[PDB]
Nucleic acid binder design. Structure first.
Ligand SMILES: Nc1ccn([C@@H]2O[C@H](COP(=O)(O)O)[C@@H](O)[C@H]2O)c(=O)n1
Ligand SMILES: Nc1ccn([C@@H]2O[C@H](COP(=O)(O)O)[C@@H](O)[C@H]2O)c(=O)n1
Ligand SMILES: [Mg+2]
Ligand SMILES: [Mg+2]
Ligand SMILES: [Mg+2]
Ligand SMILES: [Mg+2]
Ligand SMILES: [Mg+2]
Ligand SMILES: [Mg+2]
Lengths: 218, 220
RNA sequence: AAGGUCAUUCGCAAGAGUGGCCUUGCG
RNA sequence: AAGGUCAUUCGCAAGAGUGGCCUUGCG
């Protein structure tokens, strides 16, 4: 089964016990699972992104690069790099069916496995990772698709003008449990907006977006 | 320059000295060439070095165990400790302001990105050189339990296990100039209450929480 | 990391550094 | 990442994962 992934990955695993381990959720096999490779994989991949970022950025200033890094190492962006490999079909998982958290953890653990299996060659694993995603990463930046952080953008403009911060207050929580939706107000001076999501923090994000809209004509 | 010293201490000689100079230079000294960029890459690079060492050598590879260790090992305090070996502060070029733990912590992670770039971006060699100096020294600190304790975190899990409550920190005073201050903070759980001091709220809270921890486990 | 803020150094402003404070996001 | 808690899943417990909330630490 792994052979199809190894074609996409373009790498033949010498020890297949690792590749299986990184693909296995603890609900499948308790004693063998991706947990420890996800820990190694993060620091490994987060290093790749930053290393790539410092090389190809016209502006190398830390203030410019760090928020750009914040999105590229995010779990959501890892889910997009996973779509290229179609990871959701390769995972061994039983209960707690696949979601963006599980995928991002496998993707992190996946590269740690390659690092280990190659005999801890960081230089090669880097270029193998680059081979796949280098253009894809440079794509999003050059073509300007980067998840915009609205709660941050908002409060920076409000403090720019009135030297104050927007206030996010809850309205209601609606749904049975995990289907529950949050409704949150966002207020700056005389302006109020709304937003919603599966969490408070998410509901505060959409409300923050609608609020930047609300000051245009202002 | 005088860079011959640090190179021998580092067991590595730079092909580009301008790159080595840039790692030791604060923005104040040179508004043109300084360490800001290498600090960025250096964090991600050196953070990876530590994490790879933990997963490898320690018998307990369980994540919940390893992550707290990482927190101390990648910290600013621990980088200042590792930097004392290299005697970095005497090589640091700075215009205005004292050289503090922040600057040294910045220079340290930045200094390693310099070695990284100068090696032709060889991670295997650089990681080896990092272990060359610090591997046993780091591993000995864990073995001997020289890891710094987190008192705000320990205390909270202590109370939530017993009283199902959280400690509450109150600020009882402030004294001194605005740039150099003094913080006295009280920590409270049930009727048990202690004080603590620090140059920041959190630093004083860690001291207050520590006293509470000692007071508690005694009484409990 | 980023923004506002007080203090301070750059003779003041501009901006920048460092320490304190509040807040936001990423891992 | 860690702890408490609500829900949910492995027939309960134990232990663990997932979604929610409060909190704490590190980069
Ligand atoms: N609160 C923080 C602390 C660090 N960071 C990230 O970690 C990097 C390294 O920060 P340090 O200067 O603390 O080592 C930053 O450049 C930034 O990308 C962050 O994004 N948010
Ligand atoms: N709040 C957080 C989140 C993540 N982390 C670090 O990031 C690692 C991976 O976390 P993720 O699951 O978010 O990718 C953790 O094992 C821990 O070392 C942290 O130290 N503090
Ligand atoms: Mg995890
Ligand atoms: Mg991660
Ligand atoms: Mg900085
Ligand atoms: Mg750092
Ligand atoms: Mg900053
Ligand atoms: Mg966790």
């Amino acid at each position: 089964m792994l052979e199809q992934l190894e074609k996409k990955l373009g790498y033949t695993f010498k020890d297949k016990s690792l590749l299986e381990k990184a693909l296995t959720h603890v609900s499948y096999s308790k004693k063998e699972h991706y947990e420890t490779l996800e820990f190694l994989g993060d620091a490994l991949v987060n290093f790749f992104i930053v290393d790539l970022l410092v090389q190809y950025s016209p502006n190398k200033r830390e203030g410019f690069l760090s928020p750009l890094k914040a999105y590229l190492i995010s779990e959501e962006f890892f889910n997009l790099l996973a779509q290229k490999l179609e990871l959701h079909k390769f995972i061994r998982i039983k209960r707690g069916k696949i979601n963006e958290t599980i995928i991002g953890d496998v993707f992190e653990a996946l590269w740690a496995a390659v690092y280990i299996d190659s005999g801890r060659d960081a230089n090669f694993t880097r270029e193998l990772f680059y081979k796949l995603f280098k253009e894809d990463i440079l794509s999003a930046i050059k073509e300007g698709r980067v998840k915009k952080d609205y709660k941050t953008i908002l409060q920076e403009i409000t403090q720019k003008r009135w030297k104050e911060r927007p206030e996010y207050r809850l309205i209601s929580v609606e749904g049975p449990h995990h289907k529950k939706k949050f409704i949150v107000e966002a207020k700056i001076k005389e302006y109020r907006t709304l937003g919603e999501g599966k969490s408070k923090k998410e509901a505060e994000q959409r409300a923050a977006e609608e609020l930047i809209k609300l000051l245009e004509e202002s």
